[PDB]
C-alpha cells in the first residue's frame, strides 16, 4: 500500500560524475528507521539493500559506490546515488521496493544515457 511520486526515467551524460535515480514514497508512516526496508532491483538482482532493523547496507562488488541517504528515509526519500562508472555500465529499468512494517510498494525508473 505504499505510493510514490513517480518519474518515468532520468537522463545523464558523460558530464555526470554522479547519478541520482529518484525514489519518493508519499504515504510513509514510520517514525523510526528500523522498521523501513529498501531494495533496488536491476536485471533480477538486488544491487542495493538497506535493512533498517540492522542499519546495514549491502552492494555487490559491481555496484560498489551505490548508496542512499538514510537521513532522508522517514521523509520518504529512497533515491539511489551512483558514480558514473557504475551507471553507464548498468543503464536500463530499475525497481525501487520500500517496505515499512507489512506495508510494501514498488516504483520503476529508467536510467538513460544521452550521447
Amino acid at each position: 500500500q505504499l505510493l510514490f511520486n513517480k518519474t518515468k526515467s532520468v537522463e545523464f551524460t558523460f558530464g555526470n560524475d554522479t547519478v541520482v535515480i529518484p525514489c519518493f514514497v508519499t504515504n510513509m508512516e514510520a517514525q523510526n528507521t528500523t522498521e523501513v526496508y529498501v531494495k533496488w532491483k536491476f536485471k533480477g538482482r538486488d544491487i542495493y539493500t538497506f535493512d533498517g532493523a540492522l542499519n546495514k547496507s549491502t552492494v555487490p562488488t559491481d555496484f560498489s559506490s551505490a548508496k542512499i541517504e538514510v537521513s532522508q528515509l522517514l521523509k520518504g526519500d529512497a533515491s539511489l546515488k551512483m558514480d558514473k562508472s557504475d551507471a553507464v555500465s548498468h543503464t536500463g529499468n530499475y525497481t525501487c521496493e520500500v517496505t515499512e512494517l507489512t506495508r510494501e510498494g514498488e516504483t520503476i525508473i529508467e536510467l538513460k544515457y544521452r550521447v
Partner: antibody, heavy 117, light 111 residues
Framework: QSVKESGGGLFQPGGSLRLSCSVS????????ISWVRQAPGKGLEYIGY?????DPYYADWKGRFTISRDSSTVYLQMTSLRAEDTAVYFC???????????????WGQGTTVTVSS | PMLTQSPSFLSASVGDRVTITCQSS????????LSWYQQKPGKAPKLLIY???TLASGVPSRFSGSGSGTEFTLTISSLQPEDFATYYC???????????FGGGTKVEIKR
C-alpha cells in the same frame, strides 16, 4: 482474477513448444507471471518469470526458454526439445511485480507436453 | 540455494501432527522469503503460507510455518485426510536466477 493455459500435447524432437497463459481479472502491468513445470512422478521445477514491466528472467539451467507477453497473455517458447521436457507446465501469478518469489497465488490447471518421436 | 525438504515419508493419524523441514544452502532474501505450497495429485499447487509464516487467505490456522535464514519448517497440526498431498517450499534470493522449489514432501494420513 484467473489464468488459463493453452493446450499442450505431443511434440516431436524437431518441434518448438509454444504455450500461452491467458490472464483475466487482473492486469499484467501490476503482477509477474511465472512458469513452472513438473516431470511425471517428479517435483515442481521453477522455470522463470516475466516481471510486470515486461522483462523476463530465467532460473539456473536444462532448457532454452523465452517468456514473452502482450496486453493480456504470456507465452512460454521452448526450442531444441528433449525427452526431459516432458512435463506438466503451470503458469502462475507472482506477487512482487519485480518478480521476487514472494507468493505464487493464482495458478493454472496445467498442461502435459510429451516429447517423443 | 538448492532447497532440501524432509525426505518424502511424513505420516500421522487424524488429529496427529506432521513436520516437514526445508533447508536452503543460501539464506533466503530478508531471511523470510519462503512460501509453502500444497499439491494433491492431478491438481494445481495451492499456496498455503508466505513470508515464512503468513497464511494465505482461507488456509486453516493448523498450517504453521516457522524458521528464518536457511532453515524453515511446516507444521501441520490436527491432521486430516484432506491433507494427503505433497508439499513444496519455494525460496527467493538476491539474484532471481536461483529461485527454486524444494523437492517435495508427501504427507500420508494413517487411518
Amino acid at each position: 482474477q484467473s489464468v488459463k493455459e493453452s493446450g499442450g500435447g505431443l511434440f516431436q524432437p524437431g518441434g518448438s513448444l509454444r504455450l500461452s497463459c491467458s490472464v483475466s481479472g487482473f492486469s499484467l502491468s501490476s503482477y509477474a507471471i511465472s512458469w513452472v513445470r513438473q516431470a511425471p512422478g517428479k517435483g515442481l521445477e521453477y522455470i522463470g518469470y516475466i516481471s510486470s514491466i515486461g522483462d523476463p528472467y530465467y532460473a539456473d539451467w536444462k532448457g532454452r526458454f523465452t517468456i514473452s507477453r502482450d496486453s493480456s497473455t504470456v507465452y512460454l517458447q521452448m526450442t531444441s526439445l528433449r525427452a526431459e521436457d516432458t512435463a506438466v507446465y503451470f503458469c502462475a501469478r507472482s506477487y512482487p511485480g519485480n518478480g521476487d518469489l514472494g507468493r505464487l497465488d493464482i495458478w493454472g490447471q496445467g498442461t502435459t507436453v510429451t516429447v517423443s518421436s | 540455494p538448492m532447497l532440501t525438504q524432509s525426505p518424502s515419508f511424513l505420516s500421522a493419524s487424524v488429529g496427529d501432527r506432521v513436520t516437514i523441514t526445508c533447508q536452503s544452502s543460501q539464506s533466503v532474501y530478508r531471511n523470510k522469503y519462503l512460501s509453502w505450497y500444497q499439491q494433491k495429485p492431478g491438481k494445481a499447487p495451492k499456496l498455503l503460507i508466505y513470508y515464512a509464516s503468513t497464511l494465505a487467505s482461507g488456509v486453516p490456522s493448523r498450517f504453521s510455518g516457522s524458521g528464518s535464514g536457511t532453515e524453515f519448517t511446516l507444521t501441520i497440526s490436527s491432521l486430516q485426510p484432506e491433507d494427503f498431498a505433497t508439499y513444496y517450499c519455494a525460496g527467493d534470493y538476491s539474484d532471481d536466477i536461483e529461485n527454486a522449489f524444494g523437492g517435495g514432501t508427501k504427507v500420508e494420513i494413517k487411518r
